[PDB]
Amino acid sequence: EMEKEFEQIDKSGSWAAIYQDIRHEASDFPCRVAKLPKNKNRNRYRDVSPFDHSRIKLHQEDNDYINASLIKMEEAQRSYILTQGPLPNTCGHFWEMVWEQKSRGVVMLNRVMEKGSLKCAQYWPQKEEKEMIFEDTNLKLTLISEDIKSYYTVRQLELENLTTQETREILHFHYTTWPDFGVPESPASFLNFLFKVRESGSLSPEHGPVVVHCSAGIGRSGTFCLADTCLLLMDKRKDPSSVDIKKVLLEMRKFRMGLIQTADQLRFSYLAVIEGAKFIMGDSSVQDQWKELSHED
């Protein structure tokens, strides 16, 4: 049971060991396509690749490769696409993927510049009047509006397939204060953001999988997805005790390597799930408490 386990790990100060055990047991599958010479410039990090078996394929004859994985959580009945921060040459691919996969939401957990380096290309328009066209994939992207809070911003985007003139609304959820290799300020501020994404309808099975990324698409992204899936599993069963967090993380790691980068991110995942469980089990008041504690305004 998660809460008892949490206290036992804390008391014995063994988060590092628990986390390393997960690294040790984690799945290992080939990433041969990602490692092809022709794809070298499509990868942000040499050592972070999608497994072949779960990679997202772009629907183009030329090169179907993008550094992105479909995390398909069978029991939870929710899917996520985890991906790296797009590069200057893969922003067209990124939006092609969003289009083809019918995603309604994009969750961004990093800033474009972190610790002096460019962790992500500027892949969305920052001004209404300066829309972006991706010539390679024939897509147009327009900023429609944005709602800026103290630590996150929600943007409304219009994605147009120039080939069909079909348009879709994409919601962009941008968490701006989550440190690389770090954790959110609090469970409250994390859960407040997660519930914004949930309340948008972006996670509905009627849409394609939400796209989740940070810089490498594994650390912060893995933390976000683990917490969401655990809360969803608990919700479907109305039984917080039935959820084995480490087992869920290991399942997710079948679909993308390295999910959750540090022991404290793992510890933080417990914190968020334990706190979120309050809402799941019928304490609706905690949601406004998180909002307040998060200092949105």
Instruction: Report the interface residues with ligand 410, using CB under 6 A.
Output: 45, 47-48, 119, 180-181, 214-216, 218-220, 257-258, 261
Residue 282, annotated as binding a ligand: no
Residue 155, annotated as binding a ligand: no
Q: Judge whether 214 counts as a catalytic residue.
A: yes
> What is the residue type of 132?
M
**What is the Cα–Cα distance from 244 to 246, expressed in whole angstroms?**
6
> What is the residue type of 230?
C
Residue 182, C-beta contacts closer than 8 angstroms, at least 6 positions apart: 262, 264, 265
- The answer to whether 186 and 177 are in contact (CB under 8 A) is no
Residue 121, annotated as binding a ligand: no
Using only the alpha carbons of the chain, give its radius of gyration: 19
Residue 263, annotated as binding a ligand: no
Q: How far is the CB of 118 from ligand 410 (least distance, A)?
A: 10
Residue 219, annotated as binding a ligand: yes
Q: How far is the CB of 110 from ligand 410 (least distance, A)?
A: 6
User: Nearest Cα to 261, choosing from 175, 269, 10, 32?
Assistant: 269
Q: Which residue of the chain is nearest ligand 410 when measured via CB? A: 219
Please tell me the total number of residues recorded for the chain in this structure.
297
If the CB atoms of residues 181 and 238 are measured against ligand 410, the closer one turns out to be 181
- The answer to whether 155 and 171 are in contact (CB under 8 A) is yes
Q: How far is the CB of 285 from ligand 410 (least distance, A)?
A: 31
User: Nearest Cα to 2, choosing from 247, 250, 240?
Assistant: 240
- The β-bridge partners of 235 are none
Residue 283, annotated as binding a ligand: no
If the CB atoms of residues 68 and 257 are measured against ligand 410, the closer one turns out to be 257
If the CB atoms of residues 79 and 215 are measured against ligand 410, the closer one turns out to be 215
Q: How far is the CB of 131 from ligand 410 (least distance, A)?
A: 28
C-alpha distances (whole Å) from 18 to each of 4, 263, 265 are 15, 8, 12
Residue 167, C-beta contacts closer than 8 angstroms, at least 6 positions apart: 158, 159, 160, 161
> Active-site residue among 31, 91, 120, 214?
214
Residue 261, annotated as binding a ligand: yes
Q: How far is the CB of 222 from ligand 410 (least distance, A)?
A: 8
- The answer to whether 81 and 103 are in contact (CB under 8 A) is yes
Residue 66, C-beta contacts closer than 8 angstroms, at least 6 positions apart: 42, 55, 56, 58, 83, 90, 93, 94, 97
Q: How far is the CB of 108 from ligand 410 (least distance, A)?
A: 12
User: Nearest Cα to 222, choosing from 16, 3, 11, 23?
Assistant: 23
If the CB atoms of residues 55 and 104 are measured against ligand 410, the closer one turns out to be 55
If the CB atoms of residues 87 and 143 are measured against ligand 410, the closer one turns out to be 87
- The β-bridge partners of 281 are none
If the CB atoms of residues 85 and 208 are measured against ligand 410, the closer one turns out to be 85
Residues belonging to the binding site are 180, 214-220, 261
Residues belonging to the binding site for substrate are 180, 214-220, 261
Active site residues: 214
